[PDB]
Design an enzyme around this catalytic site. Sequence first.
Site, PDB file in Angstrom:
ATOM      1  N   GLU A 167       0.799  -1.234   0.000  1.00  0.00           N
ATOM      2  CA  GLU A 167       0.000   0.000   0.000  1.00  0.00           C
ATOM      3  C   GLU A 167       0.836   1.291   0.000  1.00  0.00           C
ATOM      4  O   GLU A 167       0.719   2.140   0.893  1.00  0.00           O
ATOM      5  CB  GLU A 167      -1.036  -0.037   1.142  1.00  0.00           C
ATOM      6  CG  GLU A 167      -2.082  -1.123   0.918  1.00  0.00           C
ATOM      7  CD  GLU A 167      -3.167  -1.177   1.985  1.00  0.00           C
ATOM      8  OE1 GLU A 167      -2.849  -1.309   3.187  1.00  0.00           O
ATOM      9  OE2 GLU A 167      -4.356  -1.109   1.614  1.00  0.00           O
ATOM     10  N   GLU A 197      -4.377 -10.413  -0.591  1.00  0.00           N
ATOM     11  CA  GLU A 197      -5.347 -10.296   0.505  1.00  0.00           C
ATOM     12  C   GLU A 197      -6.726 -10.524  -0.067  1.00  0.00           C
ATOM     13  O   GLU A 197      -7.100  -9.898  -1.062  1.00  0.00           O
ATOM     14  CB  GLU A 197      -5.334  -8.904   1.140  1.00  0.00           C
ATOM     15  CG  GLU A 197      -4.026  -8.511   1.762  1.00  0.00           C
ATOM     16  CD  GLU A 197      -4.031  -7.117   2.338  1.00  0.00           C
ATOM     17  OE1 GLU A 197      -5.089  -6.689   2.850  1.00  0.00           O
ATOM     18  OE2 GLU A 197      -2.962  -6.464   2.283  1.00  0.00           O
TER      19      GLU A 197
END
Lengths: 1015, 211, 174
Positions: B69, B145
Amino acid sequence: VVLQRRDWENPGVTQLNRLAAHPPFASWRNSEEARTDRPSQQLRSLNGEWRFAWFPAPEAVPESWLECDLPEADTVVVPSNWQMHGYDAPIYTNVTYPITVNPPFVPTENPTGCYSLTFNVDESWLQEGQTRIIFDGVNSAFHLWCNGRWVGYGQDSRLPSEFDLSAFLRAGENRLAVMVLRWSDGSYLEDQDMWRMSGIFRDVSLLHKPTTQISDFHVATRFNDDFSRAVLEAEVQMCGELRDYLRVTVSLWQGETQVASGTAPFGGEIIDERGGYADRVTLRLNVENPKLWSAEIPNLYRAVVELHTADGTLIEAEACDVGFREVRIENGLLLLNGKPLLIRGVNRHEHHPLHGQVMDEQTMVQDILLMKQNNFNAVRCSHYPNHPLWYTLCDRYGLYVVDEANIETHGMVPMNRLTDDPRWLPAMSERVTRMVQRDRNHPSVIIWSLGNESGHGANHDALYRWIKSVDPSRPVQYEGGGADTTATDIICPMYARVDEDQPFPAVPKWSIKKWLSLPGETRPLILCEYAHAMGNSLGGFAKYWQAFRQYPRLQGGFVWDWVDQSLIKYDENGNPWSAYGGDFGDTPNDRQFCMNGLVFADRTPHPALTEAKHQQQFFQFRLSGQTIEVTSEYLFRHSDNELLHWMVALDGKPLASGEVPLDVAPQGKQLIELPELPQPESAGQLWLTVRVVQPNATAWSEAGHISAWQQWRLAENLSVTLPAASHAIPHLTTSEMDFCIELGNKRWQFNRQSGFLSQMWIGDKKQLLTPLRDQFTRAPLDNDIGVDEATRIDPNAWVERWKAAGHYQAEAALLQCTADTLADAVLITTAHAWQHQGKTLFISRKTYRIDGSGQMAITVDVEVASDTPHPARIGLNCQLAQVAERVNWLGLGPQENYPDRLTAACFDRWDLPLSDMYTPYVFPSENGLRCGTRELNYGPHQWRGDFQFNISRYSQQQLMETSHRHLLHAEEGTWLNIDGFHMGIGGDDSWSPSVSAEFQLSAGRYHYQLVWCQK
Amino acid sequence: PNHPLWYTLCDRYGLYVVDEANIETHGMVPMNRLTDDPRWLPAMSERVTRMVQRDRNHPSVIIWSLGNESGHGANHDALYRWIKSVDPSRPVQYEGGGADTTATDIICPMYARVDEDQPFPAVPKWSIKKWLSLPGETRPLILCEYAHAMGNSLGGFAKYWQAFRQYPRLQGGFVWDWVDQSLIKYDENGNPWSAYGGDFGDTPNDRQFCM
Amino acid sequence: VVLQRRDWENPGVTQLNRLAAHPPFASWRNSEEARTDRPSQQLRSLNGEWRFAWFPAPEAVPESWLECDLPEADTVVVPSNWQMHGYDAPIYTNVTYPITVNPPFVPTENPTGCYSLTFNVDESWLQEGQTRIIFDGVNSAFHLWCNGRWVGYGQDSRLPSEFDLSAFLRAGEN
Ligand SMILES: O=C1O[C@H](CO)[C@H](O)[C@H](O)[C@H]1O
Ligand SMILES: [Mg+2]
Ligand SMILES: [Mg+2]
Ligand SMILES: [Mg+2]
Ligand code: NA
Ligand code: NA
Ligand code: NA
Ligand code: NA
Ligand code: NA
């Protein structure tokens, strides 16, 4: 704490408080001034007189200097290198580092330049906005104080370092203090083969920007398939507080005509899950039928970037020159605007004989003009980013630039020890990244380079990828680690040969023709360095150019290199001379290995330059019957400033001439019909010469400039007439010591002990000072010597092969010396053997025939033992008593030329002053040879035949014994060398035998003949 | 990167490990502000390079990750190439910038659905089935994820596994995640209770989003 | 000097005097011990009871702490998070940064943990060889002194920082 931290021995710290890099700023507050590129009130020069004091180390600097001037200090000009002002010695070293290799550490004795300046700042600059100082070049590292307070630190000698002085300054007087360190951890990445110098050697300036400012801007141009449409794309970055009323206008100008304009508010496209850049905007402008930039036609538009309010109030403006051009590699070819380039390049260091590494506009302009006048279209920034004006001048005059990061670690063992270490990736990364950030808007830059000679390490791969990701408009090259690694888009070797492989382990230098076709290989090949121009060199240059033209993917190369790195020193009388390595007390040194230029340090050409001009010609010629075929190697321009002059001459005597305008499309062909030429009666060879002349001046050349030439033999009429039969007959007179011959006022004397013509008389005056003797040696050329280092010696070098074989100490032993009277002539026959320690090297068999007309015909037949190294020359020499003004010859000229460097020379009748027949190489050697000569004239003397010759006041012995040109004295009379055969000079490199097999004197048996007379 | 013993235990017990550099700049606006800035390249390079230097001899590590991220910046491209050059023995993956950028050998989205496209601007999360066959796409897809297991969750888990088994190039993924990030707090008695975000006077907080 | 530089507010300084990273070492002097992965005499754990004092900023740390145990300080187990001992609050935030977004700066109020340990080193290690200390995990940055003198600095909370202590150590207590 500054002395305590020692940031100059920490590669983890390469700056402190330095501002971000960015393209050239001027912060204009008026758009028109931006458009016209006039001076900016907001950009001030701090160049001029500064205070300077020298210190042996940084610990020797007094704490007073921060606040008060030292009265010990002198007043020097900045920019400068302090070695040019005498403070310590400049060091010349090639590979071996100029300090002990103990990274990251430098010597405790680390010379330190303490600079300071007291200067005014106006009040207007401190009420509003931001005042920064810009040091364009500081070698090698420095700390900065303003009014006693520490501002910051910087490394990398070749890129601008910038600091915010806003909080440090006061109205009226301020004081800057700069502690410049000679050595730092930066030095480990600055091991380029050049003079190691130091100091504030590039501009210093003050720049005022508004609080709301343009802080960066990128220009891209992209094209449709046929280049009839372009989109100019400009990304503009701001600093300061964001406001809805803020706008950017990018307008594009062709002269005074605005061709396109775009305006937008800030806030870029969405980029990721968190949005976009609120502080950036991209403008896109359509441009129809753009005028394209190339080295051939450097078309430029002006882009003005205005930061302003929606209502129209200008905050600031920046600007750059824009060249519409596309650079890409497609199908293994490097294309500019869709056309395959042929790189006529040269490597160019920043060097001046008086100012060292300080550059100025005039020298830069002088270099550019010379390059383009000599058919160069490309320059490599060897091996560091250049003075910012260089790029501007290349944009405007039209040259292709290889922009190269300031990274060279040549002396490391192995060469990639630092570049493959992730701990040096930060230091390396800033040298690549800050270069790209500075220069990415210059159209002249077409290729990025990752540096020089630092092997191949993981850090190169990473930084290769960084550039591709950040700027896809340019290919990236790097030679290290074998020239074809995963870190280069272009196969870019140094000193790879045309036909010959050099299969070194791990890093072979394949023949360039072979390299292209290695299984899997697709890339284009462009030599980053080739044709080492050290002294008497550029032999075999034509061979590179023949290959470049025949092989599409061989797209040229960069000569090494442009300018001799000599420095001016003064003697007892205050006369200037040129000094190389080891002349300043410096050691270790690599001596004359710093002078590899196509020009002398003062920009006077070497003879080799004309050979580069001829091979790099943009017009090619073929002759068929009466028809000349002209082919253009221009990619973009028509021949709109070119006329062809042709001349036909018989042994230098003009018979016809004419002029025909050239009208050739790029890559096109023109046929020119010659009118019937008046086929003459008398003997000799007819020669056609053609020249391309530019009738009109250009920005880079004078009217009447010759850009190309070529010669062909036409009809030959062989002489079949018997010379006027003579009534007089020469008379032989014999003694134990001599054979003498008499005919009128002429006299020849042959020594029966030596077996050589020892003397000749005209009337009563003696003609010789030294007897006429065979010669098989030359004063060694730099290519004959073959050492790149003063320490390293090589048993394989030509001179060493010649020395070990006894060529230089070989004594003539007489075998035969008879005389015989003929019906109308005297015939002297001789034989000699040159031996060294029981081995017969050469045998020379001659006849001399003096006839009734006064001519002496010499016939020479030499044997060379097949197992002795092939000799440098087979010829005769003597010292004539006469010193005359002129030399007149029918042969190749006018300039010095050698068997493997004579394509540029033309066959004609040439007449030069004696001095021109000597080439002043700084390290003296065999020089001034002219080949293909049929007739030589000097005073009363004339020699006819088919020979090479040199003529000067300097003996081959004095030349090989003296190390500098300023130490040579003109001997008594004139030394004449007449060769039947002369070895090639070579120069593919200058540290190994480079003379090609077809230019080595290997035949075993040699024959030449000469007629000597008195006209 | 984890506690050195973790790799040793994964070597001995047998688990495939994705070793991930300690780089997350989620809070930046835009997410790549720092990772696209060359001035942050040195800091980022040390977090990648010193990880590779420490862990490269562990068999359990099969893939290197450039972090999490942080958008997609040029520094990612640089560090991707550095690893591929220094250690050819492992693929490199990185999800930032749309999960299929030039800094990843593996299409590795977070929370991309089986059948339903989520066409966000710039960083779309295509159906995993559709993503595989986008014109010119060749890479395998493994979700970094998926199946966010917050509270009463893992609905539709079976739908992932049906697609994992049917599509060769869909090679699975990593559930988010293993263990609730609740801390132990005490009341007036000495009775332990599970505390989440906000229960230590912490503000601003994202509450039960740690579990 | 350590207060003036503010290395924790410069992304260009991520370590000072830190040794190169490498795969796990134990420096066995017996081949069979290496083969069997049994403990090595040359690798010593310094885990256990340390001394610890909390401060609100690095400016509030008294200079005496360099050479002497502070009496205010408590004895605590290391390794640990000082939030798990109650010194200040653990923070939970997802996306939004727990500090004001203004790179490279951090807040002046910056909780500062001061750790110390008195320990014996045997004389064999002092006469010959190299003795280094390894911190496998320190969140988020730290300066290191050994016997009053400054050793070095390190960042990256999740990889080991290692420092050569050979020139800093003495016979007896350290
Ligand atoms: O290969 C090389 O040799 C040249 C010799 O003049 C010069 O030192 C160049 O910098 C280097 O790249
Ligand atoms: Mg440093
Ligand atoms: Mg070199
Ligand atoms: Mg820091
Ligand atoms: Na070619
Ligand atoms: Na040189
Ligand atoms: Na000489
Ligand atoms: Na599958
Ligand atoms: Na969560």
